[PDB]
Amino acid sequence: MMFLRQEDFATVVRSTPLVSLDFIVENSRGEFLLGKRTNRPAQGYWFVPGGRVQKDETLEAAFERLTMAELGLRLPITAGQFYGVWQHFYDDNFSGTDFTTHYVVLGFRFRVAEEELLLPDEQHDDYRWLTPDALLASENVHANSRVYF
C-alpha cells in the first residue's frame, strides 16, 4: 500500500506528479553531499539525496524514512530547514523511456557529521562532498540539484 508493486508505480508515474523530499546535506566544513545516480531518471548524474513520499505517509514520517534510506542516518523533520518548493521534469522514468516523470519537490537543508552517515550503495555508485562553487561548475551535476546552490 505504501511501497507499490511495479505495475502500480508505473501507472502512478505515467499519470500524476510524484511528491518528493530533496536533502541539501552540509558537512562541518561547509561542503554538500552529492551521489552519482544509478537509477533513472537523472541516471548517471550527480544529484542531492532524496526520494518520494508514499500513500498515506505523513511528511514527518517520510523525512525519517528517507533520511535513513538515503544517508543511513534517521533524522526528524525538525532538523531540516525548509528550502522551497521545486519541480523536476524528466523525459524518462524508472522503467525506461516510454513515459516522463514529474516530481513536486520539498527541499530541506541540514548539517551532519560525515563520520555518522552510513551511505548506502543501492541508488548511488559514488558520493562526494563538494563546495557550492565546485558543484555549480560541473555539467555532470544535474541542473535540478545545481539550482539549490
Ligand X SMILES: Nc1nc2c(ncn2[C@@H]2O[C@H](COP(=O)(O)OP(=O)(O)O[C@H]3O[C@H](CO)[C@@H](O)[C@H](O)[C@@H]3O)[C@@H](O)[C@H]2O)c(=O)[nH]1
Residues that bind a copy of itself (CB under 8 A): 2, 4, 8-9, 11-12, 14-19, 53-59, 82, 85, 87, 89, 100, 102, 104, 106
Which residue bears the cell 523525512?
63
Inter-CA distances, 77 with 21, 30, 33, 58, 67, Å: 11, 21, 18, 11, 9
3 is in an annotated binding site: yes
Q: Per CB under 6 A, which of residues 57..96 are in contact with ligand X?
A: 88, 94
16 vs 101: CA distance, rounded Å: 9
Say how far residue 39 (Cα) sits from the centre of its chain.
Answer: 12
110 near ligand X, rule: CB under 6 A? no
User: Cell triple for residue 52?
Assistant: 518520494
51 near ligand X, rule: CB under 6 A? yes
x/- binding map, residues 43-62, to Ca ion, per CB under 5 A?
Answer: --------x-----------
Which residue of 32, 46, 50, 109 would you call a contact of ligand X, by CB under 6 A? 50
